[PDB]
Amino acid sequence: PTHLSVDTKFKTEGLCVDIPGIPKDMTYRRLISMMGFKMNYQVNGYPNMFITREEAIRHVRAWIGFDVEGCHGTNLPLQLGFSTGVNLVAVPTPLMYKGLPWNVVRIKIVQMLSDTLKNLSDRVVFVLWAHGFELTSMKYFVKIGPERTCCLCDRRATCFSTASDTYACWHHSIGFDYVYNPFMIDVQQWGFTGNLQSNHDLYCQVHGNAHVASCDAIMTRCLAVHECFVKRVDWTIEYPIIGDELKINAACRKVQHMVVKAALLADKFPVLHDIGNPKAIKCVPQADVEWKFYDAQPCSDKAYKIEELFYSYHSDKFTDGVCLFWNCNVDRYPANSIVCRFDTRVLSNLNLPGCDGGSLYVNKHAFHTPAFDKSAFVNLKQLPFFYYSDSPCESHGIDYVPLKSATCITRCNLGGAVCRHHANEYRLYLDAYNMMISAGFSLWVYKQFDTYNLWNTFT
């Protein structure tokens, strides 16, 4: 069940206008052969250019939508589009480049895929809505063969140079001319009615169709992400560590405790309504409050309507005390809320472009997140940075400069000289806070919140 059998059937109706006469009866084996590659009954970790829906989902970080459009087949120029927004024109002799032979076009393709993917993935998955010219164009920029390692590292080979006769990974690929052992999946095999634009536009208003290869490449990947991550969700799939996943996750846990602890000391709510993760624990275990939990999974399509979360008849009175939405994305938080909300517009190696202004946040798990919406926070304000500790001032066991800060809310600062312990803890908490913010999370609080109210929790 692991890899896609080359003897699996491929539906060819999508191909039959670019490739008139194509047999209705077709295997991957016969297709790969038609595309001009040979698999030489090779047991060597590359059983099939094509992959399963499941294998594609495990390798979502590798997805590059790919589309070719006739400009005028061997006679005519081809427009090559990628979900990066790039259009190359190959001649057989948004970004829109003029006509150039394959021997240069293939160099740009390696550069582009290398720069896009070296910090995402060990491979490429071309995501297709196949009509034929994209499949027949692959021979011009792709070599296949046994799985290999980089010449300069232990990462698997994704590129090949005919100049030096060597293999590189995405990190070491500079001056290479061929994509080596790519993967591909044809979305059109998944059983849709009607064309790409009609299927994409059911779900997504944010990507248009200018009738250029890059636009279709983008719609193809977007529709795929919609199918695999919006409509269908799988929180039982792991994904490897490629960045600061672990620091960001730790940071998030530290800020959550800090902000909620300070909220209860400052405003002394008798009840907290904790709306979201059904595995959640009390983030402030010692706090005095009545802690009531409401279960909701991450919304991956549209933000939850607060009408549905709350009404339809709990503590019922969610106007009593404070509401904690920790990555529980709604359309409009009530005024008595503490909110963490992911900003889908953030550029990072963890956040992949998604469907209808949403983004795909891949950190241990994959979480499609609805489009960041400023209007959601109208009853709240941005939560200002601050560090609060009631821990004793006592070093124990990190070279020093005396810390001066208005936002270091401690006994020692109240007494006008921050102790070394609270200065180390403060500087750590600020780093965590910046990690978390710069990872795209944004924090919001009820308007009455005032760090001034914390200073009398020491007297």
Residue set of the binding site for Zn(2+): 150, 153, 169, 172, 200, 204, 207, 222, 393, 412, 419, 422
Cβ neighbour number for residue 236 with a 10 Å cutoff: 6
Give the binding range for Zn ion (CB under 5 A) out of 33-41, 179-187, 216-224, 265-273.
216-224
Binders of Zn ion among residues 376 to 395 (CB under 5 A) are 393
Residue 107's binding partner, choosing from ligand NZJ, Zn ion, none, with beta-carbon cut-off 5 to 8 A by kind?
none
Q: Shortest Cβ distance from residue 270 to ligand NZJ (Å)?
A: 24
Residue 298's binding partner, choosing from Zn ion, ligand NZJ, none, with beta-carbon cut-off 5 to 8 A by kind?
ligand NZJ
Nearest CA to 413 among 438, 387, 445, 433?
387
DSSP line for 264-312: HHHH--SEEEEEE-TT---SSTT--SEEEEEE-PPPSSSPBPHHHHH--
Written as one letter, the residue type at 275 is I
- Residue 290 is among the residues annotated as catalytic for this protein: no
Q: Shortest Cβ distance from residue 440 to ligand NZJ (Å)?
A: 8
- The nearer residue to Zn ion, 100 or 206, going by C-beta atoms, is 206
Which element (helix H / strand E) includes 219? Answer: helix 213-225
Which element (helix H / strand E) includes 407? Answer: none
Binding-site sequence positions for S-adenosyl-L-methionine: 274-280
Cβ neighbour number for residue 63 with a 10 Å cutoff: 27
Residue 39's binding partner, choosing from Zn ion, ligand NZJ, none, with beta-carbon cut-off 5 to 8 A by kind?
none
> Under the criterion CB under 5 A, does residue 152 sit at the interface with Zn ion?
yes
User: What residues does 159 pair with on adjacent strands?
Assistant: 168, 179
Q: Shortest Cβ distance from residue 199 to Zn ion (Å)?
A: 10
Which element (helix H / strand E) includes 197? Answer: helix 196-200
Binders of Zn ion among residues 10 to 69 (CB under 5 A) are none
User: What residues does 164 pair with on adjacent strands?
Assistant: none
- The dihedral through the CA atoms of 181, 183, 196, 84 has a sign that is negative
- Residue 134 is among the residues annotated as catalytic for this protein: yes
- Residue 69 is among the residues annotated as catalytic for this protein: yes
DSSP-derived secondary structure letter, 83: T
Cβ neighbour number for residue 399 with a 10 Å cutoff: 3
- Residue 216 is among the residues annotated as catalytic for this protein: yes
- The nearer residue to ligand NZJ, 19 or 296, going by C-beta atoms, is 296
Q: Shortest Cβ distance from residue 341 to ligand NZJ (Å)?
A: 8
Residue 361's binding partner, choosing from ligand NZJ, Zn ion, none, with beta-carbon cut-off 5 to 8 A by kind?
ligand NZJ
Q: Give Cα separations from 456 to 89, 338, 449, 451 (angstroms).
A: 69, 22, 15, 10
Query: Position of tokens 């919304």?
Result: 299
Written as one letter, the residue type at 181 is N
- Residue 343 is among the residues annotated as catalytic for this protein: no
Residue 150's binding partner, choosing from Zn ion, ligand NZJ, none, with beta-carbon cut-off 5 to 8 A by kind?
Zn ion
Binders of Zn ion among residues 158 to 197 (CB under 5 A) are 169, 171-172
- The nearer residue to Zn ion, 222 or 445, going by C-beta atoms, is 222
**Which tokens in the block code for residue 346?**
């953030």
Residue 222's binding partner, choosing from ligand NZJ, Zn ion, none, with beta-carbon cut-off 5 to 8 A by kind?
Zn ion
Binders of Zn ion among residues 415 to 434 (CB under 5 A) are 419, 422
Q: Which of 134, 177, 186, 227 is catalytic?
A: 134
**Which tokens in the block code for residue 317?**
């009175």
**Which tokens in the block code for residue 408?**
């270091």
Nearest CA to 297 among 236, 351, 235?
235
Phi first, then psi: what are they for 308, rounded to 5°?
Answer: -75, -45
* Residues lying near ligand NZJ in the complex (CB under 6 A): 276-277, 296-298, 326-328, 342, 361, 367, 369
Q: Which of 72, 165, 211, 314 is catalytic?
A: 211
Catalytic residues: 67, 69, 134, 211, 216
Give the footprint of Zn ion on this chain (CB under 5 A): 150, 152-153, 155, 169, 171-172, 204, 207, 222, 393, 410, 412, 419, 422
